[PDB]
Design a protein around this nucleic acid. Sequence first.
DNA 1: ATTATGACGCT
DNA 2: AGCGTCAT
Length: 430
Amino acid sequence: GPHMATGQDRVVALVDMDCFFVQVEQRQNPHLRNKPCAVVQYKSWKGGGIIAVSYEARAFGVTRSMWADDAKKLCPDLLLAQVRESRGKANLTKYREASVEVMEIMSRFAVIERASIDEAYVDLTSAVQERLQKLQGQPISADLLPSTYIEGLPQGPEETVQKEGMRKQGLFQWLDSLQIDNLTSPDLQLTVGAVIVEEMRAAIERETGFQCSAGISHNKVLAKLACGLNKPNRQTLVSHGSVPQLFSQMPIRKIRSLGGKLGASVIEILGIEYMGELTQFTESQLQSHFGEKNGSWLYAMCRGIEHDPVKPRQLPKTIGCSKNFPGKTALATREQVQWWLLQLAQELEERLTKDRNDNDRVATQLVVSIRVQGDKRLSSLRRCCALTRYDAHKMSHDAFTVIKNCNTSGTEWSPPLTMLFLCATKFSAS
DNA sequence: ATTATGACGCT
DNA sequence: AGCGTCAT
Ligand SMILES: Nc1ncnc2c1ncn2[C@H]1C[C@H](O)[C@@H](COP(=O)(O)NP(=O)(O)OP(=O)(O)O)O1
Ligand SMILES: [Mg+2]
Ligand SMILES: [Mg+2]
């Protein structure tokens, strides 16, 4: 009892931007603000593919992966913004630069781990300790947490007919219970972490004009889950004590890393649907079905416990460019293949050169991946070679050299390629 | 014809 | 080294 770890050692948050690519386009074009809007790529086929959707547009049922022509059927007044196109492919530079704006603000507060173009984990354990020392015995006011939800509250016994009324009542219950006394209560630490995350979210909105949501908990999985509970423009605190009720009706697929085959297996092999049901199995039983690492992870995670560290990494480990060639457009000639490789290499060269100037590093390996027609896998084949010069002509020529014997017969290229992907990796200081 | 592209585990 | 999974 006295010796059972409860996964309450850290304070971790996950900050994720709300409808991020849309906000980027709305900041730039004020006519799009506060309107049902989506961002699309490649307008020629079915009006383009939607990759981001404003919350006003979601209310009509518009979603990612939907065709714009189809989205317009659900939402006639839907406004659209097109992703920039360069060299015949989508160019996501505008969103990467916007991402940098936000990541640089978050880094001021604590160590972060970039997790995607629009989210990062934050390890607030040290910052909370410092803040706790800064205010001795200072009780925490509700005004310090104007956009925070406490998951699981309010509980027990009219302002609650509306959502802000629920939020405030739950926050009051939580704050009324908190003992400022006792610098080591995990709940107190989370609360101070939440205050700091309000400050962080305020700074991002002030300095970039972008709104975001956040989750604060004791580990990355719970912080990520918490982030999505009250999006948009709100933050949610998930305490250790909230986990049994929260996990009791939480579908297994909603937990990070369980959204694929492993999660399906868990459900299928154990005959359960919710994360909390995992507690009735022994660690050995879970290890026997899903392996040593997965079994141990599951046994601790269904109890709200996870030890994956927030890595101190702001910069991407790899830099890559890819393009799909669906259906009839699959590449069928040598020349075609070489031209598209050159287009990808030119974009890559730009991004690498910038990376070298900004971050004092150079990539040393080039990985080329291709997908052949009829193959469902992301990558049909991967090959690599040395990246010794940031030269687009050398890179595209070397990439062709490494995959040219994949061609069964021809001038002609077969089987046709439905994807080309160039990735620069193995960075070293410069 | 659900795209562009990341991190990282397994062998 | 090369492939498979899970992810936004
Ligand atoms: N499958 C995909 N393919 C291409 N781009 C994608 C993508 N999923 C996301 N993006 C791009 C476009 C997105 O804007 C961005 C962030 O991904 P989220 O955080 O998953 N989604 P958002 O921020 O939009 O809304 P909110 O978080 O409020 O739910 O990455
Ligand atoms: Mg987001
Ligand atoms: Mg995200």
